[PDB]
Homo-oligomer: A and B are copies of this chain.
């Protein structure tokens, strides 16, 4: 009735034209679940690694046929016969079946696809919404969106070291209003960039990568777009950063060389000077979030940055924690960062994703459910964000259905919740003080 009868994987395309896989789960009564895996990384020291074919004559070595065969010929036989509502048991069985810390034998993509498909099939069997199945009865908080609007760093050729600039409409009454505000600021920025003769064609996440003079130019243009849309910066819409400082960090010189992206006249700053630069940016602009402000190995720099700025601006560790429970626990013990970026494919299963989210929540940190560069039409991360009541999501810009699908799912969730739906905005930043 709920016993899993069929587990079947196939190879599909992601939003970047690269192969990924999807897994379909069928039970006895006809309950159906489909999980599509976002594209992650096949290399990593302590992050779950996805399995790639490595056949240079097929998709440039990015095929996912090996992981499809792993699902169809290994995982399917182990999982068929389980109860579809035994998500923790199935995920534990798959982890034990892989037998390696980084899920390299079967592939983290294969395991994640089976986990998502099983969870969705169980929600289909129970005839409950997916967020209701995942987070229980008390799921009401619509996450505060952190919408990427301008790209820098290695995502653009402009002289900007920081990788992402984002708008956070934390002053909106509802999620529907926040989405409308974000879309209107997006279109106002599009108009402003057209007037200035800058490029408008969008990147991987749907945001622009224009030719700016620097970080201050981009932040000021974002402020101008916010005001052109008709909203107050620092009251209605705030600014978030994704510096990705690990890209321009000299390991042996222990400096943050901005010259890699900002020309030979840029500022090569130490960890302390980087802290003062971030503090200057926070005191100058309505910046409420900074992501990857220090290198993934600059633990002392992260602790000093948290001491200096951890009470007024959210500090998110993306590569600092790489959704690893061990790294998150060490960072909590050492008072480094106050927020973790949750990526479901960098850990492997939904059980461990929720374990990381609850460990971050129990320590006062904020969990930000995040997209990847290669996404799909699957919008499970919106259901994860609502189910955990995380209160924050980072699912891209307002310009591609790889990103807009999550916003549409959040709109559907808010409509379904109705009068019990809650949008908290600045209250979602419970890691901050006042």
The minimal Cβ–Cβ distance linking A357 to chain B, given in whole angstroms, is 9
Residues in chain B near residue A16, CB distance under 8 A:
399
Decide yes or no: A401 and B376 within 8 Å by CB, A136-B134, A354-B138 being known contacts. Answer: yes
Interface contact A399-B89, CB-CB below 8 Å = no
The minimal Cβ–Cβ distance linking A187 to chain B, given in whole angstroms, is 6
Q: Does A209 contact B (CB under 8 A)?
A: yes
Residue of B whose beta carbon sits closest to that of A96: B419
Distance A140 CA – B354 CA, assembled complex (angstroms): 11
> Which stretch of A164-172, A304-312, A408-416 is in the interface?
A408-416
Interface contact A13-B408, CB-CB below 8 Å = yes
Residues in chain B near residue A183, CB distance under 8 A:
13, 17-18, 59
Q: On chain A, which size bracket covers the interface?
A: 35 or more
Residues in chain B near residue A78, CB distance under 8 A:
none
Residues in chain B near residue A128, CB distance under 8 A:
85, 126
Interface contact A187-B401, CB-CB below 8 Å = no
* Highest count of chain B CB atoms <10 Å: which of A13, A60, A376: A13
* Highest count of chain B CB atoms <10 Å: which of A17, A186, A430: A17
Residues of chain A whose beta carbon lies under 8 Å from any beta carbon of chain B: 10-18, 22, 30, 58-60, 85, 87-89, 92, 119, 122, 126-128, 132-140, 179-180, 183-184, 186-187, 199, 201-203, 209, 333, 350-351, 354-355, 358, 361-364, 375-377, 379, 387, 389, 398-402, 404-405, 407-408, 411-412, 415, 418-420, 430, 433-434
